Design a protein around this ligand. Structure first.
Ligand SMILES: [Zn+2]
Length: 57
């Protein structure tokens, strides 16, 4: 137990140490899985449809 804040607030993120891709994400070869919304997109489509974000790469 540690004190020093307003109201007990449990966190999930690792303090004093941030990581990336904590888990795996099933994505197709051709198409590309968005990151902001993580919605299916069209390889040819240089943008998203759910968030309309520019395709990475
Ligand atoms: Zn998107």
């Amino acid at each position: 137990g540690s004190s020093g804040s307003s109201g007990s607030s449990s966190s999930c993120t690792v303090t004093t140490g941030t990581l990336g891709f904590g888990d795996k994400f099933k994505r197709p070869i051709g198409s590309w899985e968005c990151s902001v919304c993580c919605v299916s997109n069209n390889a040819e489509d240089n943008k998203c449809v759910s968030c309309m974000s520019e395709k990475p790469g």
